[model samples]
Target: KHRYSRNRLYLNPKEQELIKDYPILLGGAGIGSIIAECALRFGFENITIVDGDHVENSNLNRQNYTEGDVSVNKVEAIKARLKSINSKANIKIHNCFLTSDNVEEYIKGHKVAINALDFSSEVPLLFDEICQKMDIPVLHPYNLGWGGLVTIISPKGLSLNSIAKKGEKFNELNVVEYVSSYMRFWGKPQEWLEDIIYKFKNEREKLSPPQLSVGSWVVAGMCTHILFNIATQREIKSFPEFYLSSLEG
Candidate 1:
């Protein structure tokens, strides 16, 4: 409690307790690794981290990893770091890829979940669907070069599957195009994203989209704020209406 005393300034005692008591399931360990760190620092004690990928040198630029973490399973690496931050934190690490067969077990009792799976795969699509079916709140946060955008998939409202244009599939790899075109409720992804979008549209298979550490930190802050709002029963808008915190603007 001493460590989080400063958190008491804004978060009431009961709100802090709610955050500490709630279980959060975070899939994938990219920017999500940072999100987990933010969660623990703010008194979120129960967390489950799932990711099969290993930390690579390239990830050092923006992900929550160190040179020592290279080659280690992403979940394990993040779990180790989180434990170092708060030795008493209850952190669960699953060092395997999430598949349709195994996603639900990790999701089923968590108060809320975050989808940070491989964007190239359709797993995120399923992640949202199952969590919603279980009446859980799930969020998808994306790092947009200079900034980040987060979409909350409300259990009772529209999901990416429902918001996506007819006959089109929505995955991180290709959702920005939809955001710029059909899903313009949030205005547009920052204008600077135009070039990256072009490259993403044509060479997604070969290139990893650009991201910055600043944006990752911003996303984590926004997400933790959202989780706090949810924990305290604050009103939050769902998908088709998202939150974007961009540095460029």
Candidate 2:
């Protein structure tokens, strides 16, 4: 048996049952990668990750991939590394992006989905839409610079899209800008914000570099608790559509 260490507190029979569910489907490699690591370490039986992009040298700072992992799809690279970490766990890697056409098939038979995507703005919104359709919970998480936001949305629980909704016809606008102060790198404006009068247009994405302390630590910690909640079958009051904004400044 592996020698007990810092995580010895988590090696109980109850925890083992929790890890057995392993219902998490990580969507984005950037932040989702860490979630996968934690779940697998806990002996989660199944975890599928869906991501189209590959690991770039830039990911070395905060992401789990390394320079050698560059030029490969994020899903594959992540999977390769994860396998080394735990050969017994089951992991599925989806090399394609999730779309309206493929979303149905992509999310099938999963207990919950994790939103860890960056860039490709509409995916988060798409998560809400798909979860609403699939009736699966979305363990949504976002990292600004200093902090991150973690919110859980249940099928029958409160709707995150509704709680975070800024105005009517939100779907018509850029959801990213609505929630964040960043600008779209496409050098274009969104339709909804175009109609509404604003003094200036902010950058579509965060400007600061990501740090491990707030970015990965907070996300990893939150995911563990959320996973625990799913395991204990406890009533999740704050989540079921929760959000933790790390860098609001």
Candidate 3:
């Protein structure tokens, strides 16, 4: 009935109608920009974004920021980009980090939230706590080299803390180690392993474990797909669990 005429074939009028009303609260607009884009294209209108980082030249490698976006606050830059895609998009920008003091206020009323914050940061823990208190689901998607990980945490479901082995936090180093370990034991392409080692040995300072642009795109697509399942109250295949895999083998 609305402008999503093409969606009618895949989603009925009711499904499309439901999608438009489902609200999303997103934390961190770094790699999260692609998720916002996918949500907008899929007809999701209401979105609340929070981020304190500025668009830097380095972000262009994997993030959705363009050269023009450099120096702009990530939340505002992302808002401008999303508006370009859909002028009618109702996006609220909180151009600050999600901290214990302000997160609850920023995330109020949203049905679901997505965690795109840095893995080593404290925001992920804060997000999990708030979502648990608010009785909302949190979809966390992250990129790791050529692969990615997506985890859906429900109000009364499994948590990230539970998934860790002893002192294993899902930090950047742990993620890098996991990939390296897999390559060594389970097996990844030799070229991929060689590239990882090369980056680790040479680009140590810039060695934040290389993430391909495709990884961001994959996370975005998967986030939207998971969002649809949550919105529809459909049988979620990956909820309360983790999904880790390599996209292009």
Candidate 4:
């Protein structure tokens, strides 16, 4: 109880007990780093995270990791951090890229799923399909510039593929171009957009779009709130909405 005493103020006794028993599966450890940290803070003892990436110095700018973690597998690095935070936490790690073949095995048995995957990869689209079949609710959080977007898809709610624009395979799409299409709501500031475009043009081989450190914090907070609502069985709006500046707002 010493580790979770502070959380009791916000989470009732039953809710706290529920959290300790909740099984959470986090996909893509890139941005999933922050999501894992938040879940640990909320007293989630059972969590399994899967990712195929190893940490590089570049990930330090936004991902919840440190300089010493460079070159380590993202899931293992984040797992170590979670263990440091709560030695009692049952953090499982799958140090492999999630393909259609292995995704089901990794996702099975979790009560809820959080897709922190790259928008450019087919992983999110594929993972959502499986979750829908498993009747598991999933939350997808994407970081834009200084703000971000969050959408929760329940077994009874709208599916990700149904809402996403029809297109080529998600894996084949250019991540920057695909995400920039959603900028009507989560638009980046002018200077940030220009610099991002310049970098993308110069680094033609890049697979991801530029994301801000501030955006990481924003997405992390949004995920925590959404998860808290889900864990407490409190109804939350289920749809994509921009946080921070909005074109219509």
Top-lDDT structure, candidate number: 1
Q: What TM-score does structure 3 among the candidates reach?
A: 0.84
Worst 10-residue lDDT window, candidate 3: 171-180
Q: Which candidate has the top score in TM-score?
A: 1
Better of 1 and 4 by lDDT: 1
**Candidate 1 residue-wise lDDT at 38:** 89
In candidate 4, how many Å is residue 114 off? 0.7
TM-score, candidate 1, is: 0.91
Off by more than 4 A, model 4:
119-122, 163-165, 169-207, 240-249
Candidate 3: regions farther than 4 A off: 165-170, 175-207, 238-240, 245-249
Tens digit of per-residue lDDT, candidate 1, span 1-249: 788888766987888888887999999899899899987898899999888889999999889999999998988889889999999889988887888898889898899999888756547788888998998898888887676788899988887876555676556645565555543444653456666687766873766667888889899998999988888889887887787777654
What is the lDDT, from 0 to 100, of the residue 158 in candidate 3? Answer: 68
**Structural similarity to truth (TM-score) of each candidate:** 0.91, 0.73, 0.84, 0.82
Instruction: Give the distance in Å from residue 178's predicted Cα in candidate 1 to where it truly belongs.
Output: 3.2
Q: Global lDDT of each model?
A: 0.83, 0.65, 0.77, 0.74
TM-score: the better of candidates 2 and 3: 3
Task: Please give the lDDT score at residue 66 for candidate 2.
Answer: 76
Ranking by lDDT: 1, 3, 4, 2
Tens digit per residue, CA lDDT, model 3, 16-122: 88888788999989878988998889888889888888999878988878999999999989999999988878998888876777878877899999987886565
Q: Model 4: per-residue lDDT, tens digit, 127-200?
A: 87788789778887766656555677777766656544687554313333444556534554344444666676
Per-residue lDDT tens digits of candidate 2, residues 13-111? Answer: 666766666567788887788777766775675888988887877677667787788889999988988889877668888998877677667777887
Query: On a 0 to 100 scale, what is the lDDT of residue 183 in model 2?
Result: 29
Give per-residue lDDT, candidate 2, residue 28: 84
